[PDB]
Design a protein around this ligand. Structure first.
Ligand code: NGT
Length: 323
């Protein structure tokens, strides 16, 4: 059994709870297993947080209200859909850091890297970890789903982490700490593949499953880890193929563009065809593949209405889930 999931960037692009409910409808209709809610990135933190000071119980253009989010999860669970929270650490973090800035400038200066406003100081900084751990406790609580007790998961990010190649062991140790927090609440931790190196893989908690989206190149020009490599060190992977399984909804796109996307997916997509440097659709023969996901990234969706978002996403969801 392979899982199939949809991942929705609700950070770079605002989504009503109704749009998300209709998306989950389509996921359930076609026998999908999960939806991944990428709600924290540089542009915005798009759910409600006591801890960060997003409390309004009223609908708004910034974040899902607590009850909105909780309604969405209850809805998804009723359709046998697991909701997987996705909070991006330690980079892609400007959104909630700006919230910490406004809440407590002193704490902000104690946890932000000296060089990036998007990156939390993962370089062995205790107060950075403590802040994150509190934010994670709130998030683990919000996404509690008793129907999926003992199968819940959370994406902790780990993608595009500046400094992580050179300072690999600090990256890994940080990822292990936040892994530890979430295992405390019985979730399985997950992260993107891209910032983990040969140096780091031996120290990484193998409780992590990996979201394999694109094989990285080291600064030497050498090839970074592939799925076999991850298999060799005990890591399960999921195919998030950056070509076949990524799509950026855009105002410019018509019906014919969506038709072309579906014709492309017909040949480009398979459950086990990952994006390797050499072959963008590389068939892999390992035993560590657990599923796949189509992902809607939000950063081209600037001028899309809720309706036009549905019009683009709904058919791609259906096509992917039936391939
Ligand atoms: C994981 C990934 N991190 C990036 C996202 O943050 C961007 O939205 C998009 C690039 O345009 O895809 C890559 S994949």
């Amino acid at each position: 059994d392979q899982e199939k999931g949809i991942t929705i960037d609700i950070s770079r692009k605002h989504y009503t709870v109704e749009t998300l409910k209709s998306l989950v409808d389509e996921i359930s209709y076609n026998g999908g297993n999960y939806v991944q809610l990428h709600f924290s990135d540089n542009e915005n933190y798009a759910i409600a947080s006591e801890y960060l000071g997003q409390s309004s119980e009223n609908t708004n253009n910034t974040y899902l209200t607590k009850n909105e989010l909780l309604s969405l999860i209850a809805y998804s669970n009723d359709k046998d859909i697991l909701v997987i929270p996705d909070i991006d650490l330690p980079a892609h973090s400007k959104g909630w850091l700006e919230l910490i800035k406004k809440k407590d400038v002193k704490l902000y200066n104690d946890i932000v890297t000296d060089y990036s406003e998007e990156t939390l100081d993962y370089y062995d900084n205790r107060v950075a970890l403590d802040t994150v751990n509190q934010l994670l406790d709130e998030v683990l609580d919000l996404f509690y789903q008793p129907k999926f007790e003992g199968k819940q998961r959370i994406v902790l990010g780990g993608d595009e982490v500046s400094g992580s190649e050179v300072h690999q062991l600090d990256f890994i140790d940080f990822m292990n700490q936040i892994a530890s927090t979430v295992k405390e609440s019985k979730y399985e931790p997950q992260m993107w593949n891209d910032s983990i190196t040969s140096e780091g893989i031996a120290n990484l908690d193998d409780s992590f499953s990996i979201l394999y989206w694109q094989q990285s190149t080291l600064s030497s020009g050498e090839e970074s880890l592939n799925v076999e490599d991850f298999e060799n060190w005990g890591f399960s992977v999921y195919n998030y193929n950056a070509y076949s399984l990524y799509f950026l909804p855009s105002n410019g796109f018509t019906q014919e563009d969506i038709n072309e996307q579906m014709d492309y997916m017909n040949w480009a997509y398979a459950h086990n065809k990952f994006f390797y440097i050499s072959d963008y659709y590389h068939a892999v023969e390992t035993s560590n593949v657990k599923g796949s996901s189509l992902t809607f990234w939000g950063e081209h969706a600037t001028d899309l209405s809720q309706k036009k978002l549905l019009k683009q996403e709904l058919p791609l969801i259906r096509h992917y889930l039936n391939l």
